[PDB]
RNA sequence: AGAGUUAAAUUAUAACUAAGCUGUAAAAAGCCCUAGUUAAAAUAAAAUAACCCACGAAAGUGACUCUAAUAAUCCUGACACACGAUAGCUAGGACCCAAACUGGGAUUAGAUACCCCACUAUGCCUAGCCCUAAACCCAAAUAGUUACAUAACAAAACUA
């Protein structure tokens, strides 16, 4: 049997380390009129704006490239016992699985 | 080391003999302490103009 | 078309002229805009008073001269006398914060004076003389 | 250098400036102070019209004299310079090189203050 | 018994702290050109921390140096010297919009 | 009252070798004449502790 | 007074535009805080009132900055809901 | 940035004299203030002045 | 705590111009030895920096320079000793400005109040007193804990 610590040590998320400026392939699972919900796969899904070029090439299930900025947007404010999670990650759109 | 360093600077001190020469050379060698700074934190000296 | 809002100090060598005269020789217009009155005095560069006009000098009254229309009229009244002595450009120096602050400045243009610059010389003490006590005890 | 005099001499001719500097340095030496260096910062325009010795001064020559003096002779030199009609505004300060530069660590991220109020439901 | 357990070590991804524009510098009262970069060109007001962006020590040192220079007679109080008006902008305040 | 001479060669430069061979300018600079009140306080403290105490 | 004139708080008009130059000068004064200081110095304020005003202004500034920060943080969630009707 | 709040309020753990004395607790509410309506002012005053300038002279 | 200095404003003081200036929601009174610009000593206070939170036991302190200097190898502890914001007293000095009181002008049935004007003690320096404050951060000092546990509000509940 394999232990949770052993698998977590070799997990790709552990290998990534910090989530600042990391290239991640994410697959879009939901489509809005102008917003794309890209699931980079870590914890949450990031919402991005459809670019002007190759706009029709972004469909459901399409895999794209992102530069991850924040794994989860949480912040504290005045008189807050806990943080206010946004249930979303921050990332930018660069390309769509160049190959 | 402090004493040794101060011995070197004791040679260039202004005395009675060197008063006339020091005043004349100061009146002919102007000095400026002006220097600006940049957003990146780099020192720029206006002496290039 | 590189234009700078900073004044043309005499220490520089820039070539800016108004009606053939340099920025230093252009006459001055001191506009003291108080809370109850607005006074305008147009003087030459040599500090020689050329024209003088206040809201009270135009036949107004106690509360009448404190409005912006009184300052606008006083601007035209001062501009007419300034033009009568041959003045085409003037540097406006504003003194004090009052209701007739911009009104006099625009009244000068209405009366026929071309403003090249607006200087705000408002007396702000560095915690000097103690002002009067507050109202509505 | 221990003390630094920021001498502001009246804008005059070269021989007069030299004589004024000579007598000022002699006065500094008479008080029991050895002079390290004298640097001329040049004759500039005064930021404001300084009125001194019943005279309105618009220009002036800047000089910087660094020296070592006892703590008791500072006011005596200040008094001597106050009565000199060729000095616009004399000032003796501590030399900036005496204070060693401290490690500017930078901005330390200060977290927002919590637990300032009770957890009672509003 | 487990070797893959995490070890209580210091964070290797510790990003260095940001430095002020004058971090590890020497603030002086005679470099009026340097001192003028933090004052308002129109009124001579000293800009605050939210404008200058200097970590605590240097803001106070700049304020003290400016106050010393303005009374010693090296830098004007009412306005900024136009000779230093062309200095590069380090402040984060924009007047003309 | 104690009378520390102005040329006492304060303790910060007193216990170093080759201090008496230096010139009068450096000796005067390192002496108590150019020193503040703190150096005289240190000199008086050491002088009193050397003569009153048994284990300085 | 002792300083040189026509240097401080002076703006040069452009192409005869005076109303805009006056607005520029007013913005200069407002950003430098001179308008508020002039309006405050008309009548003397006691130190207790000055301290109360400073504390109130600091608290208001803190609250406004935090509210603006939260609004900017939550601006993302203003998009149309993709799971309507679930 | 946000002004510092450490050591400002009067608390048992704070050893120094309090700096800020809030009128109301510094708790971020769940609703922003309503936009205030601008106060109106008289208009066309400068044009009424030049209109009456005709009458005063004619 | 001493010694020295003044950037802005204001004023005693002169010159040119002009007739009002100041005054409020509106007026009246007052000054027209008035108002604006240009120069200007002395006194008082110390814009922005300060969205900083430091120093001091507290009161209190943030215009600049210099000297002296901020106890305790650090528990609590008086009726004992030393300080003690503003206000007031005594003697000497200064007095730009503000202002108790006062005298006028408004409003009111009345206004010995709020509003405007002028001015005094006083606020300013030295010495000597007086020893009071919502002197409150209404939370005693010394070393601690987040265990049990919300009368209510407020700055959470507690140990030796
Ligand atoms: Mg009351
Ligand atoms: Mg303390
Ligand atoms: Mg309350
Ligand atoms: Mg004293
Ligand atoms: Mg002055
Ligand atoms: Mg007098
Ligand atoms: Mg009357
Ligand atoms: Mg000040
Ligand atoms: Mg101690
Ligand atoms: Mg005890
Ligand atoms: Mg008293
Ligand atoms: Mg009096
Ligand atoms: Mg009065
Ligand atoms: Mg009465
Ligand atoms: Mg007392
Ligand atoms: Mg108190
Ligand atoms: Mg009590
Ligand atoms: Mg006790
Ligand atoms: Mg209940
Ligand atoms: Zn720094």
From TrEMBL, chain A:
Gene Ontology CC annotation, any one: mitochondrial small ribosomal subunit
GO BP annotations, alphabetical order: mitochondrial translation
Transmembrane intervals: none
Keyword set, alphabetical order: Ribonucleoprotein, Ribosomal protein
Keyword Isomerase: no
Protein name in UniProt: 28S ribosomal protein S28, mitochondrial
Taxon lineage: Eukaryota, Metazoa, Chordata, Craniata, Vertebrata
Gene: MRPS28
From TrEMBL, chain C:
Subcellular location: Mitochondrion
An annotated GO BP: translation
Lipid metabolism as UniProt keyword: no
GO cellular component: mitochondrial inner membrane; mitochondrial small ribosomal subunit
Main location: mitochondrion
Family under the similarity heading: Belongs to the universal ribosomal protein uS11 family.
Name of protein: Small ribosomal subunit protein uS11m
Organism: Sus scrofa
Full-protein interval shown: 60 to 196 of 196
Automatic annotation (TrEMBL), chain E:
Main location: mitochondrion
GO cellular component terms given for this protein: mitochondrial inner membrane; mitochondrial small ribosomal subunit
The entry's keywords: 2Fe-2S, Iron, Iron-sulfur, Metal-binding, Mitochondrion, Ribonucleoprotein, Ribosomal protein, Transit peptide, Zinc
Statement: the UniProt record of this protein carries the keyword Methyltransferase: no
Domain of life: Eukaryota
Subcellular location: Mitochondrion
List of residues binding Zn(2+): 20, 23, 55
Molecular function (Gene Ontology), one example: structural constituent of ribosome
Any coiled-coil regions, as ranges: none
Sites where the protein binds [2Fe-2S] cluster: 20, 23, 55
GO biological process: translation
Family statement: Belongs to the bacterial ribosomal protein bS18 family.
Protein name from the UniProt record: Small ribosomal subunit protein bS18m
GN (gene name): MRPS18C
From TrEMBL, chain H:
Binding residue positions for Mg(2+): 24
Name of the protein: Coiled-coil-helix-coiled-coil-helix domain containing 1
N-acetylalanine modifications at: 1
The encoding gene: CHCHD1
Taxonomic path: Eukaryota, Metazoa, Chordata, Craniata, Vertebrata
Taxonomic source organism: Sus scrofa (Pig)
